[PDB]
């Protein structure tokens, strides 16, 4: 059972390493940092059981900032708009 003593009295055991945006000693960010303060802002006063069916938008792109899962596919699909037609015209680019 989760007692949460560090809430009652004053100490911090961990609570700092926890999330992707807290301090980072010299104030240097992460890559997807800016989407945390967006997504936590969403579900806080929530009780998290409606969160899943409420927010879900600010979460998904955040999952797609992290892994770049889609942008890598729409990218890999330029290799099929060009580089099947190389011989068929528009070498693209002119170098330089």
């Amino acid at each position: 059972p989760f007692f949460d003593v560090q809430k009652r009295l004053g100490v911090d055991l961990d609570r700092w390493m926890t999330i992707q945006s807290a301090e980072q000693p010299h104030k240097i960010p992460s890559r997807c940092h800016a989407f945390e303060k967006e997504w936590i802002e969403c579900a806080h006063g929530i009780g998290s059981i409606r969160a899943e069916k409420e927010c879900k938008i600010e979460f998904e792109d955040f999952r797609e900032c992290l892994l770049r899962q889609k942008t890598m596919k729409r990218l890999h699909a330029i290799r099929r708009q060009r580089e099947k037609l190389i011989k068929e015209g528009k070498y693209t680019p002119p170098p330089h």
Binding site: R31, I57, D61, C65, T71, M72, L75, R79, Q81, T92
Partner: protein, 71 residues
């Protein structure tokens, strides 16, 4: 000063990697010109694959791995 040189180097860099994309093909089952892979709208620093395309010859290899393994 040093930075105000870079930000111009990438915005120049996206345009050529777009304007020289949108003129490759305009396909009916293609993509709109410069859509967004996200819903949200603001400026998010681009991934290496954005700046350099499938170009992938050398000056890339001296960019990503440039700093590491040596002066």
């Amino acid at each position: 000063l040093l930075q105000a040189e870079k930000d111009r180097r990438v915005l120049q860099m996206l345009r050529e990697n777009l304007e020289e994309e949108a003129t490759v093909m305009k396909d009916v089952p293609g993509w709109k010109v410069g859509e967004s892979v996200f819903h949200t709208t603001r400026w998010v620093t681009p991934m290496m694959g954005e700046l350099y395309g499938l170009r992938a010859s050398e000056e890339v290899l001296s960019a990503t791995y440039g700093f590491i393994w040596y002066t």
